[PDB]
Design a protein around this nucleic acid. Structure first.
Ligand SMILES: Nc1nc2c(ncn2[C@@H]2O[C@H](COP(=O)(O)OP(=O)(O)NP(=O)(O)O)[C@@H](O)[C@H]2O)c(=O)[nH]1
Ligand SMILES: [Mg+2]
Length: 426
RNA sequence: GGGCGUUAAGUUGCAGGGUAUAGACCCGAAACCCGGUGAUCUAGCCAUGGGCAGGUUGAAGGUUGGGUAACACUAACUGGAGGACCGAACCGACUAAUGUUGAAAAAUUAGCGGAUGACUUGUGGCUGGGGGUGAAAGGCCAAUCAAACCGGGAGAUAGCUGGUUCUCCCCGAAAGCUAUUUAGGUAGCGCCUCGUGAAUUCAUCUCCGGGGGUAGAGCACUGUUUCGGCAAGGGGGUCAUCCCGACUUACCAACCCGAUGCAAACUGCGAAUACCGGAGAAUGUUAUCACGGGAGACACACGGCGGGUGCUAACGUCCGUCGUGAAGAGGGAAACAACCCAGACCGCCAGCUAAGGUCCCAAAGUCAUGGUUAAGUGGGAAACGAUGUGGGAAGGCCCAGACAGCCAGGAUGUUGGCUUAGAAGCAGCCAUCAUUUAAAGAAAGCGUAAUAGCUCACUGGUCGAGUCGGCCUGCGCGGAAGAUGUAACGGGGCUAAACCAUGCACCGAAGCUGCGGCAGCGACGCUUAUGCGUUGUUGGGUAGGGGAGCGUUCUGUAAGCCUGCGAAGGUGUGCUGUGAGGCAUGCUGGAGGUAUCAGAAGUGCGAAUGCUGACAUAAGUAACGAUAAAGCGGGUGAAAAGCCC
RNA sequence: ACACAGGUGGUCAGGUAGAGAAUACCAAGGCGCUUGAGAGAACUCGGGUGAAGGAACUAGGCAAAAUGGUGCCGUAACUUC
RNA sequence: AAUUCCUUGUCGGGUAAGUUCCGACCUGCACGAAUGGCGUAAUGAUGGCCAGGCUGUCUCCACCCGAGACUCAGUGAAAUUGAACUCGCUGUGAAGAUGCAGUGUACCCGCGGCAAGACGGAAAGACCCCGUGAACCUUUACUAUAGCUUGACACUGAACA
RNA sequence: UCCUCCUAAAGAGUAACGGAGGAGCACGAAGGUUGGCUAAUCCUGGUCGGACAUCAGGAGGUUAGUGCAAUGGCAUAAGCCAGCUUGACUGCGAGCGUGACGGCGCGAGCAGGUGCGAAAGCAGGUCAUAGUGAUCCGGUGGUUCUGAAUGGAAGGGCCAUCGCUCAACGGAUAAAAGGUACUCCGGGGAUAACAGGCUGAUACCGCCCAAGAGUUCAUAUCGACGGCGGUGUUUGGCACCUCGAUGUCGGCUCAUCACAUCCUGGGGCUGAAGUAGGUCCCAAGGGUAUGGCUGUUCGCCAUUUAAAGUGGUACGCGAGCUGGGUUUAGAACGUCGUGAGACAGUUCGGUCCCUAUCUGCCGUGGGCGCUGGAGAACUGAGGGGGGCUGCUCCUAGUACGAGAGGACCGGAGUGGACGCAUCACUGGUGUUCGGGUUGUCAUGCCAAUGGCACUGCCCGGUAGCUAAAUGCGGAAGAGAUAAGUGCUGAAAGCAUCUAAGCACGAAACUUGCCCCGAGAUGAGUUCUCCCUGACCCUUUAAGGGUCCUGAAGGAACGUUGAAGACGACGACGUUGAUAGGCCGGGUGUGUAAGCGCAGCGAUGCGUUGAGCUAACCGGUACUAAUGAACCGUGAGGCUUAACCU
């Protein structure tokens, strides 16, 4: 059952930050959820100061209120922030008329309205599938009432347990198709076997400007806007680097607090690039007070997806609003998990980003000042051919001095192929 | 006036068609209720007697002292308690397994609980059916218990299931509408049948006299639509004198203009066919309608057409409308109710045809001629792919010689400027001209770090007729994988035995045709119940209606007649009719059977898980009753594993 | 329903070993259970023994294997003592 | 949790492996005090679970001993059956073919062995539905009444006041 | 229930849990009548006045207007205003419409009195259809109609009218709730639950288009939005098949096919350094995880292996088992119910029947066949089994690669699983082989020996037999092939793997190995061996009969077997080793008996490796296997030409 719940309708919204201990979503970020969802917003019903209930999630009275609010203002749907167990939705339904949805199914709905690549399709509908598989379970009741209550002769196994197995088969089927996929992108990753494989990946919330930095650094077409899901689909484009020249890039989708469980499980394919990635570049916003939290938000999922062992590089993007500083190097240490001073739409901070990077990935800077007598056209050749002369200075009788800095694999492919009696490089 | 009437042959039999009340054809329910029988099984209770081996624990208590004023404390010693243990007798059933047509309508074997107690048992007693009983389960109440057994109102009713017996000729349904405590029922009418009546009653064909709003078509309207319009109002705008306001709308969107379609519930149009009245001919047994006597039938399926629905599915449902089936046999599509052809009164070792076929199974063309197919297409299929091959129109090039290959040239500006280590025909970038010449691009591909080679585009020459395509089009390939065995022509097998067209022969059904019978039916003549005579015509059939019968048994008829020199009964035998049947005669029989025409019926059986009586069948199989075994010598004895010693 | 493996009350209690009216073996006393004989196949029944391993089997240690006795030694949580 | 749906919730203990279990945890889908709650000595032919032991349970089974199976003799059964000359493959078809089609194979006839089929036997589907079938209970279905409750009047008199 | 529109097929009429919708009244005027008026919407102008009120002027032609659904209706308006009015009367109805009926609709004219207009003439409810109830039993009112001895009266009818959501609307009655798991009765495939059957929306597999990513790149690999197919497995519908019974999930024995490929096998490309992969193609030969957890299939987890392939097969397999889940009665919890009661909410407990006729299956038989008869040896017509593979070194640290890392092929080894076969080894096993010993019994007693107690308990072991033991086995090479790679080579001057014609090419194909195998009804080969007698009548492919012959060979019985269920199949039957014996050896138990002698004794010491000894090896005619008899024969059918006479 790949079915979609629509985004873009009138809704009684109910939310309660006002729970007292877990807390979460001041509302406004949830409103953004609502926004990029395209929901027809109506009103913001809100309850009080409660621990969550075995009842109707929130309190009795407030529940009755949202019910009436629906019945009067005519909301197309009771949107209801913060997740619940299915029966909770059930009892809530008894007091209403319309579809209810937790934070989850919202996020899936919008997610699916965003799907464009077939990969995104499968992992989405997968997350949709695993999610709905739970919730269906109480719904036997009607189906049972029409069934007669005894007379299961033939089958031993009960129905709907049947349906349970159905959706299990769906599940395995979906992932089954997912298999050849991760294998696919992996065949793309065999190229990551070549020893010369820089491999960055970006991370942050949605509207962490990820699209933007990616833009300016790439001179490539990746659209960016206020909305959540401002990007979907990993996106490869190569870039320059002072010490490995080629340098593969691939943008990740932006994050939120408490992104869905099964989402990730479906989403491991897409992030499968992140894991291997040799460096976790991480943009962060500079306008929100949300700062810390978002990092704490991001760290969350990073944990569950491994490779949080990776060296990282923070970029306090959006320095424009703040005039935090002139863009700068910001050695957290000689180690450099550095903060970096950006405003990506201006992107004024870049050169320090690249330079700091230039410090952060290498392993052989013993430079050499190479030289030859009229036999260097081939040298200049190799140097432009592969990476870089650091400096080209011709001199007397065709004797010509140079400086070059390459990673060692070059040094030996060169020392081998060329006579290299020129012998400045090893 | 209008309604009924005015009107104008009935009644008693008798045979019979119904229909009414009764068991109304027979078989069959769960229960309902009344009168009776039980407590020997068990449940409970009552009196009265019995049963409970062996072992072990040790309360209370007692006795003696520590101990302390004493108490507490406490020694032992005895003392013998108890829904107590351990385990036989007796009780009881937890686990396995056999056995489950078993040895036994709950046993068997091995393991288990109680076992001096709310125990167990002898023997008698009392409680009874809507009642008893209940350590209560809805369990027991003679193995039967959510209300016993057993006799009677009892043929309880049964709108369901079953089945309902001899023969020919005639006719032929329906599976619908309305209503239905109705949906598998039944009733009124539709349809069949019979009997009576009467319009030339009707049906086809034509001709005339009609009506119309679907198909189609169409865009005013109805709503929809696309794009130009067009102005267009307008939130802007616009500007500025602040603004008089001008101006701008360059967005905005009507209204109307032009052209585009779209429609079950839009229509300024509007067919066929049907419907409907008149007219006429021929043709059909008045085919019509009215009436009276009887029905069943009320659930239809598929096919062609018109639809709804569905998924423009289903052997799907639901209507329309029509065909076969049902209730129709033949032939063909291999096998085929629902397709094509054709409605079997019966015979005939005659004939011709139908659809459909004709190299063999296998009936007939190895038919004629013309054209295509290269695949076994035929003999399973698409979007789609392509120097497959047939066909076609037209178009391009060319004997001033093209097309293919082949001889050679490939140019100067100028390595274009920019880029840059280097770019320059080929890192780019943008310019990319001008020249020469038949010829050559600042460039189509390779190459170089880059530079410089390498090939065509370009052409001369060469060579000598055709050459390059798009379009249309028949017929073919690619796409194209299934379950147990070739299995997607019936097979053999095909290269014509495929396929396209034309023609001739022939096969091929019960249809038709000749020959021969039989039967209705009308018919006019004949004739009178007559008979005929002639002729036309007809004769597949379940529900169901109608006509004729066959046969048994009794009664009349018979004190007839048949029979002992063989009646009835069995089993032969031939003779005979359209038939059920008769008739003849050998075998047994050893006693009775009934022409003829009447009379009446328990009157005709293959079926009901019919019912009794005889006998098949598994099979000469499984088994023969506890796995506590016998061996022997002698005895009688028709015989000795059994018995006698 | 039977010469059926079921049930049926009360009396009697020999030895030898052992607590014993169990078991073990015999007294007195009955009994060889009304079809056999041959043969030594699967399979079933009822059993006897296993190398290695030791519950991996299996719904589940089901079955089966596995402990017994006498005396002396010593005997936890917890205990309503 | 004998309570939970969700749910193999979370948590750690036990396991190489933990849908059970054990103990916490507390968003108790939908615990709660006589409709008794919380504990607990001992008690269980009680529910779940672990460890020691042994073990043909098994991994895989092997021979031995018994009684049936076999043959021989005597006896002498049943269940069931439209009729038998009662092959496969593949079609076909009241839609799962021994019986048709076309095709393939195959002397005549027992014995013991195996149980896929012969929609094999056994009993009128208990499931499901139908029927103006029945029974039994149920309660604020109706409609009746027993027992019960009020009141009259009679057996019922007397006086006063 | 009733009304309008579509479905509806140009008339009616026509259905669906098909498409839209209205209705249970309103009015004494919204009615009778004559007299007059005629629409919305639109432009200009104009006080508040405005987009939009009122007024003028035009425009325009009912797009307005109908008491409300809708559709047809509508200018002589029906719509509108106003006067007059009760025709919203009264008894009658030519004759029509649609109804099965009940019943419903229109109707002129007339009778009797109205009412309007001058008159013509207009009025028996409204523009039209929707606006509602039969029956009974009663009420109110009238009543020139009855009234039970007569006179009244009560009562009834006659006529007027009233009493209903009887709305499940043709209305079972004044009066009408649930539960069954305790179950029941008669039916049903006329309708569910299982499975098939049909179909493929769904699911599932390809296929086209190429938006894109895939570091540049659309097509190594992915493929967006979209399309056509295929499979007939998943979920569904469809209810034709079964309810006079087809047993249902999981496991457990057991396989069987497909190929839509899990490995191994062969190839194309690669984003193929090699290592490896990824896809694609070709391939069905074989092979393809034990455990934990839960009834599970799954799924998850731990560790493996080359691989842990898919799916079909009544979701293969209950007349083979299993009975944990599934669904009964017991009970409990939460929860819903006032309840009895239920719940797919969970927990406890809970009976698997069939001795095999047919089929087909596995063995193994007897009859007859094969042209006189045997006896042994055959050939191969056909059939089956057989098919896995790791891991190590050698090639060689080589080709590869900067390194790391590490090959191709060839060859050597050495295993897992599986199959085949023998006991010699290792053992297993051993109820007949020996010894130990508790209980007791008996043997007169005695130390001595037997009986019983699971074989009494135990101890080892021959033989037989068996894996756990041990050898052997799956090829090689040919033949013809796939996919692919080729040569040459034209049709088309060039091309070109193809048209011609050669070269390749794999666990698959056919052989190559083993087993089977003339019932191979085509009934075959070679070799051996045997019978070569007379007479009689009938029909003469023919005998028949006499008589006389009986052969090789067959058996029949018996001795027995490593042969065997029985059969069969061996070995032997006195010219003999087949058995049992018997003799020896061998074999294991472990040194006996009796006696001797140290010890009071239990016992011992020496007599002594003792005796004891199967299933065995070597030996031996002691017993048994005797001989007649019995089956079978007596010389071999015609044709046909060959060669010989
Ligand atoms: N002031 C400011 N605005 C910024 C900055 N970076 C991005 N933005 C704006 O914030 C929005 C970020 O869009 P986006 O890049 O898509 O955010 P994202 O984090 O990439 N989301 P996603 O990864 O889903 O695309 C855009 O409007 C972007 O221009 C920044 O550094 N400063
Ligand atoms: Mg981004």
């Amino acid at each position: 059952m790949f079915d979609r719940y629509d985004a873009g309708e009138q809704a009684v919204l109910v939310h309660i930050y006002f729970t007292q201990d877990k807390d979460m979503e001041d509302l406004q970020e949830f409103e953004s959820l609502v926004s990029s969802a395209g929901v027809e917003a109506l009103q913001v019903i809100t309850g009080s100061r409660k621990a969550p209930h075995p009842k109707y999630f929130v309190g009795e009275g407030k529940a009755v209120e949202i019910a009436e609010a629906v019945k009067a203002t005519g909301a197309s749907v009771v949107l209801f922030d913060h997740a619940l167990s299915p029966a909770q939705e059930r009892n809530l339904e008894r007091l209403c008329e319309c579809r209810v949805i937790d934070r989850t199914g919202l996020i899936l709905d919008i997610f699916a309205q965003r799907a464009r690549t077939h990969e995104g399709k499968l992992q989405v509908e997968l997350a949709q599938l695993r999610h709905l598989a739970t919730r269906l379970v109480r719904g036997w009741t009607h189906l049972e009432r029409q069934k007669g209550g005894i007379g299961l002769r033939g089958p031993g196994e009960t129905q709907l347990e049947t349906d349970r197995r159905l959706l299990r088969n769906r599940i395995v089927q979906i992932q089954s198709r997912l298999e050849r996929v991760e294998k696919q992108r992996e065949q793309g990753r065999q190229s990551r076997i070549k020893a010369d494989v820089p491999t960055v990946s970006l991370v942050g919330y949605t509207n962490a400007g990820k699209s933007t930095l990616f833009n300016r650094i790439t001179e490539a077409r990746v659209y960016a806007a206020d909305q959540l899901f401002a990007t979907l689909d990993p996106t490869l484009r190569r870039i320059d680097v002072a010490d490995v020249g080629e340098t593969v890039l691939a943008d990740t989708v932006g994050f939120i607090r408490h992104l869905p469980h099964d989402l990730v499980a479906a989403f491991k394919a897409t992030l499968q690039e992140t894991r291997q990635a040799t460096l976790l570049l991480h943009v962060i916003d500079a306008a929100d007070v949300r700062v810390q939290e978002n990092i704490e938000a991001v760290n969350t999922v990073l944990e569950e997806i491994d490779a949080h062992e990776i060296p990282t590089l923070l970029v306090m993007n959006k320095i424009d609003m703040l005039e935090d500083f002139e863009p700068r190097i910001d050695r957290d240490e000689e180690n450099k998990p550095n903060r970096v001073w950006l405003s990506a739409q201006t992107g004024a901070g870049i050169p320090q980003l690249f330079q700091a990077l230039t410090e952060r990935l290498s392993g052989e800077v013993a430079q050499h000042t190479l030289r030859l007598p009229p036999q260097e056209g081939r040298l200049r050749s190799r140097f432009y051919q592969l990476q870089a002369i650091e400096k080209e200075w011709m001199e007397e009788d065709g004797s010509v001095s140079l400086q070059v800095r390459m990673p060692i694999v070059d040094w030996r492919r060169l020392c081998k192929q060329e006579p290299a009696l020129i012998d400045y490089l090893i």
